[PDB]
Amino acid sequence: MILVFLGPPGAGKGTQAKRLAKEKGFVHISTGDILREAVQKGTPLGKKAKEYMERGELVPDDLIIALIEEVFPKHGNVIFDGFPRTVKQAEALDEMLEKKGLKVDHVLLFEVPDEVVIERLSGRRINPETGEVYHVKYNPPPPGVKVIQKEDDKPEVIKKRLEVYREQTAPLIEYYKKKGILRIIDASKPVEEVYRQVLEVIG
Numbered sequence: 001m002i003l004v005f006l007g008p009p010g011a012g013k014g015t016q017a018k019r020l021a022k023e024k025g026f027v028h029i030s031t032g033d034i035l036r037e038a039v040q041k042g043t044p045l046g047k048k049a050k051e052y053m054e055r056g057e058l059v060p061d062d063l064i065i066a067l068i069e070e071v072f073p074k075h076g077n078v079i080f081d082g083f084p085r086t087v088k089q090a091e092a093l094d095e096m097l098e099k100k101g102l103k104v105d106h107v108l109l110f111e112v113p114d115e116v117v118i119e120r121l122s123g124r125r126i127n128p129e130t131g132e133v134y135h136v137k138y139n140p141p142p143p144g145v146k147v148i149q150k151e152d153d154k155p156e157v158i159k160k161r162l163e164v165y166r167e168q169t170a171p172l173i174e175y176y177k178k179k180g181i182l183r184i185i186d187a188s189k190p191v192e193e194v195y196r197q198v199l200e201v202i203g
């Protein structure tokens with residue numbers, strides 16, 4: 001089974017992807033996590049991607065398409081989490097999979113109002129070393145676990161990221177709807193309730 005998680009930044013896609021991958025045996029492909037690793041390592045991809053990420057912009061399509069070609073699991077279940085982010089990326093994904101006799105089975109849209117998004121992101125804290133994600137209100141980190149607020153989770157960059165999402169990424173909703181594979185998730189609910197709905201729509 002191949003899944004795509006789609007929706008505004010802060011919707012809880014990474015949180016649910018980690019949960020589903022671990023419980024139901026999926027390979028979790030997070031372009032965000034993979035890019036952040038590239039940046040930390042100072043690879044050619046990382047050095048180029050860094051400036052876009054810092055500004056809240058999307059990394060150029062060709063870079064991301066190449067990355068996915070490089071890391072796509074040949075066999076097994078996959079969750080694409082944060083990819084595709086543009087129509088060109090979605091078209092490239094369809095082409096890649098078709099060459100392998102595969103397809104995207106379900107696209108889950110994590111629906112959540114802008115106001116909730118802003119609250120999710122502004123309160124997001126991460127463990128810089130493990131990438132583990134917390135929320136100052138909804139899932140506070142234990143004391144003694146060192147967390148930070150990501151620079152791209154500050155008000156100005158959140159605003160940009162949501163604008164970029166609406167312009168470039170939201171059209172994927174209609175792209176996938178017309179393939180018949182879109183399922184709707186109310187991502188505004190608490191974490192366990194959202195997870196139950198994720199299990200429901202793919203079962």
Ligand SMILES: Nc1ncnc2c1ncn2[C@@H]1O[C@H](COP(=O)(O)OP(=O)(O)O)[C@@H](O)[C@H]1O
Nearest residue numbers: 009010031032052053057058059064082083085
């Ligand atoms: N598929 C992609 N295409 C282009 N850029 C991407 C992609 N995935 C991640 N990025 C870059 O990494 C940043 C963080 O991505 P991600 O971790 O998916 O988002 P979020 O902060 O909403 O969880 C994005 O704002 C963008 O700069």
Ligand SMILES: Nc1ncnc2c1ncn2[C@@H]1O[C@H](COP(=O)(O)OP(=O)(O)O)[C@@H](O)[C@H]1O
Nearest residue numbers: 010011012013014015120124134135138190191
């Ligand atoms: N259902 C939920 N209710 C409340 N907070 C959540 C929920 N899901 C995730 N969060 C918190 O919201 C923030 C964004 O979650 P994340 O998984 O990083 O979203 P995305 O990957 O869609 O950008 C994080 O701080 C996370 O702890």
